[PDB]
Amino acid sequence: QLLEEQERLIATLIEAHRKTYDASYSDFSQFRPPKRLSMLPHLADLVSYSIQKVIGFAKMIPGFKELCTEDQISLLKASAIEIIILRSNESFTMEDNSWTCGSNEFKYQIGDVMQAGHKLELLEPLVKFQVNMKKLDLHEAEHVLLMAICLFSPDRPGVQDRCRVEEVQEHLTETLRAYIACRHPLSCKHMLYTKMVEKLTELRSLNEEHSKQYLQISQDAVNKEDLPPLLLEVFGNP
Amino acid sequence: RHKILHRLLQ
Numbered sequence A: 001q002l003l004e005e006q007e008r009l010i011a012t013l014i015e016a017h018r019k020t021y022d023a024s025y026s027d028f029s030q031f032r033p034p035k036r037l038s039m040l041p042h043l044a045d046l047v048s049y050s051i052q053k054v055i056g057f058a059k060m061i062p063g064f065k066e067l068c069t070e071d072q073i074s075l076l077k078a079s080a081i082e083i084i085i086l087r088s089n090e091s092f093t094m095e096d097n098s099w100t101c102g103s104n105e106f107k108y109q110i111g112d113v114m115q116a117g118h119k120l121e122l123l124e125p126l127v128k129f130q131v132n133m134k135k136l137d138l139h140e141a142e143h144v145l146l147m148a149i150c151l152f153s154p155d156r157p158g159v160q161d162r163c164r165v166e167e168v169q170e171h172l173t174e175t176l177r178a179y180i181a182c183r184h185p186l187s188c189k190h191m192l193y194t195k196m197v198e199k200l201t202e203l204r205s206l207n208e209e210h211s212k213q214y215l216q217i218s219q220d221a222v223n224k225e226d227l228p229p230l231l232l233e234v235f236g237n238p
Numbered sequence B: 001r002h003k004i005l006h007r008l009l010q
């Protein structure tokens, strides 16, 4: 019951995600080295890397490049951390509640991310998010529709053409529902779709809390060389 | 402005 166009869309997004996500984690050797705000330079380098991948991903979702430049920028700045948190589930493992990226030297757990200045009000819900998304056990297509739907939120600050944005989300979400209804015939379709948008709501709270702590981290690391230009454009600059 | 972000979008 999945239309040919919904099947093509899912296919496009899976192609986009594979091109902009690198499960060999081979550029990690290039970031500044981890140290165990001692982990800020490495973790900052990582998010600045990752944001660029998110931008690569965006540009390949149909109808995003067709947006005006200011809309794209306001969409990226609203959801950039939320999409990094989603896509990071790929490297997350419940075997020790870490993000592990090719080797144990690039293995991040809740403690390493407090040596980058963050606090329990974000980290604890962060790892609970990671564990619970794992238990969702999403198919590759559900994963990538979620990252796209989280980007095409017409309610973000600064969005000028909200009608166009809602149309793309409409399309995105109709396709998600259809997939759930086909692929999971034994579950309540309403129940499955709700458990996924619920994650989108918890991504907004993770994002507000991250925003809050970043303000003070960046102010703290203002004279040091710790934050790279891209994070400053995305998250703020004091 | 947002120099780098602007250049990524091309």
Ligand SMILES: C=C1/C(=C\C=C2/CCC[C@]3(C)[C@@H]([C@H](C)CCCC(C)(C)O)CC[C@@H]23)C[C@@H](O)C[C@@H]1O
Pocket (backbone or CB within 6 Å): A040, A043, A044, A046, A047, A050, A084, A085, A087, A088, A089, A090, A091, A092, A099, A101, A108, A113, A116, A118, A214, A217, A231
């Ligand atoms: C990114 C990706 C990865 C990990 C993400 C993690 C684990 C380390 C801590 C991170 C980076 C969180 C930090 C609390 C964010 C802090 C950002 C800053 C220090 C600038 O305020 C955000 C998501 C978490 C690895 C790989 O999956 C690519 C993915 O894309």
Ligand SMILES: [Mg+2]
Pocket (backbone or CB within 6 Å): A020, A021, A022, A023, A050, A053
């Ligand atoms: Mg990647």
Ligand SMILES: [Mg+2]
Pocket (backbone or CB within 6 Å): A183, A184, A185, A186, A187
């Ligand atoms: Mg089923």
